[PDB]
């Protein structure tokens, strides 16, 4: 079965052909037909199986059939754990609706509240959003949601692990329920997942269980390397690393798509032959670049960890994690295995700031061996002068740096393991200097005794 | 008139209606007062009276309709400003429960 044999709209078929996906995957093959039928579905697929497309196809087709327009409000709501997955889903959805007329939107924390409010007031039919910010917008901002028809919950196990149980249940009770398709993808099936499902879905769910049950969690056959780098020499250390182990295969994981874009462009100016993979690119030529990297001899791939989850890493020499890992446990096991890479000795190192040394005790309690690195200070290629000159002389670099900086800061804020990766121990001056600025641009880091005789409230309406 | 008649009382005026009743409670706490008599004028024509036992005591709302003040020259009566009155309660204040509460307040 392909997208062609599955009878969809001509616009959707052309969009799929333009993206390049021809053979349907497992979930994309046996989930889309029930979803377009209209049956609520719970699935346990793992990231990288194409569930994003698997749930976007029904929503887009339903919007096209119902003939939604920006004035009707939201028709499809995507609930995502993190803003990086939100942006990945947004890129995929833009790829789908390139030929359609309904509009797609993003509502994430650590973003301009007034801009999102204006976006919602103007009107979006397919909206991808994070739990807390979505719930705040529903409670406080004026926009149309009375014509909602489809609700996807992506990685609900991640959502509950982060701790948005109250946010999600309030979202469920606030949003309309009648005549509403409910699709819920979550790998692990815990008690919190059971509760969220029992309140969310209708009495009859269709359940999909081909989660990869052969989880080869390697507890001992791993060796984690780490480099303790100061905040303001992180990019310089990366540059010296790349220079020294050129003619070797390198894969570096960043946190955010804007950071990937800025580093790619900056390395192009500073003469780094580099293959890049970030969200704003086209899916087809992303596949082309991945194929080239797999079938190359040397070369360095700049890609993010959330995309590497879906990517199948070939045999490479070095796996570097420059930004803090999105998932610590999955990060350790998965990418240590993919780094050490079968036969050839592969090495995986992580960048640690001086304020982030609790990860060492973390790994020690995790019972895994680690190795530290030295980076002799004279081998650091000091080019920060050229960096600051280019950032101050090129406007496009100024933008790319500002989005990269703010995206990194907001990701570090909405990082799960706060005890190690807490933002309040960061020095914004040095992180901005590593990004190339002289002054850290405006970013909002945030993003008893009650009244005498004050009895609680048994009546009255507040909005 | 009630201020003249009530010698353990303190007069105060112009409470913002946009404020809160428990804010009246901190006002009474500031004045160290265990009872509050609130005059709320609606339409500037109709009186609303609140009798409240300040700290955690039950409160009663009445609506005042017909008004005659001491300054009218048809009363022909006068007494001491603050002397103890004979409290002449009716029987319904003795049988009926919410009238029990009104009598106590």
């Amino acid at each position: 079965q392909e997208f062609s044999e599955l009878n969809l709209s001509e616009k959707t078929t052309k969009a799929i052909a333009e993206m390049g996906f021809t053979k349907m995957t497992e979930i994309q093959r046996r989930a889309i037909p029930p979803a377009l039928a209209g049956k609520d579905v719970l699935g346990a697929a793992k990231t990288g199986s194409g569930k994003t497309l698997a749930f976007l196809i029904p929503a887009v087709e339903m919007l096209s059939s119902l003939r939604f327009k920006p004035r009707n409000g939201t028709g499809a709501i995507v609930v995502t754990p993190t803003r990086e997955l939100a942006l990945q889903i947004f890129g995929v959805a833009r790829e789908l609706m390139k030929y359609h007329s309904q509009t797609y939107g993003v509502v994430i924390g650590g973003a301009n509240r007034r801009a999102e409010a204006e976006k919602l007031g103007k009107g979006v039919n397919l909206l991808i959003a994070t739990p807390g910010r979505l719930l705040d917008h529903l409670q406080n901002t004026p926009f149309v949601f009375k014509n909602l028809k489809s609700l996807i919950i992506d990685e609900a196990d991640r959502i509950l692990e982060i701790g948005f149980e109250d946010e999600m249940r309030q979202i469920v009770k606030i949003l309309p329920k009648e005549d509403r398709q409910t699709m819920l993808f979550s790998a692990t099936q815990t008690t919190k997942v059971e509760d969220l499902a029992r309140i969310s879905l209708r009495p009859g769910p269709l359940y999909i269980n081909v989660d990869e049950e052969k989880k080869y969690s390697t507890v001992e056959g791993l060796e984690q390397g780490y480099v303790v780098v100061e905040a303001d020499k992180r990019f310089l250390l990366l540059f010296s690393f790349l220079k020294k182990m050129a003619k070797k295969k390198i894969i570096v994981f960043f946190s955010s798509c804007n950071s990937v874009k800025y580093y790619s462009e900056l390395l192009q100016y500073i003469d780094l032959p580099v293959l890049d993979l970030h969200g704003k690119q086209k899916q087809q030529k992303r596949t082309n670049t991945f194929f080239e990297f797999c079938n190359a001899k040397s070369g360095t791939l700049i890609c993010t960890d959330v995309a590497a989850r879906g990517l199948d890493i070939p045999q490479v020499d070095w796996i570097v994690q420059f930004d803090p890992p999105d998932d610590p446990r999955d990060y350790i096991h998965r990418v240590g295995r993919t780094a050490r890479g079968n036969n050839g000795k592969g090495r995986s190192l992580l960048f640690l700031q001086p304020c982030e040394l609790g990860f060492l005790a973390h790994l020690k309690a995790a019972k895994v061996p680690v190795v530290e690195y030295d980076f002799p200070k004279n081998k650091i290629l000091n080019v920060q002068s050229q960096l600051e000159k280019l950032i101050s002389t090129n406007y496009y670099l100024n933008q790319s740096a500002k989005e990269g900086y703010r995206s990194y800061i907001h990701a570090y804020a909405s990082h799960s393991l706060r005890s190690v990766f807490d933002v309040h121990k960061l020095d914004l001056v040095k992180v901005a200097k590593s990004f190339g600025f002289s002054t850290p641009p405006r970013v909002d880091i945030t993003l008893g005794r009650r009244a005498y005789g004050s009895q609680p409230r048994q009546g009255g309406r507040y909005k | 008139d009630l201020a003249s008649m009530l010698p353990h009382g303190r007069k105060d005026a112009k409470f913002d209606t946009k404020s809160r009743l428990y804010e009246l409670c901190e006002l009474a706490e500031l004045y160290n007062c265990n009872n509050v008599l609130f005059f709320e004028a609606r339409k500037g024509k109709d009186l609303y009276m609140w009798f409240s036992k300040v700290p955690n005591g039950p409160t009663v709302k009445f609506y005042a309709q017909n008004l005659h003040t001491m300054e009218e020259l048809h009363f022909q009566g006068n007494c001491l400003k603050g002397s103890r009155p004979i409290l002449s309660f009716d029987a319904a204040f003795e049988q009926e429960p919410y009238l029990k509460v009104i009598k106590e307040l």
Binding site: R329, A361, S416, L417, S419, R449, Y452, P456 | N56
Partner: peptide, 29 residues
């Protein structure tokens, strides 16, 4: 003392709480 490996470490009053007429939390000051 991180018990579980990869999770975060788990972590003046003026009113007295009583029960009201309607079975709700009444506040004694």
């Amino acid at each position: 003392e991180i018990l579980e490996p990869f999770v975060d470490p788990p972590r003046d009053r003026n009113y007295r709480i009583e029960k009201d007429a309607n079975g709700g939390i009444r506040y004694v000051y």
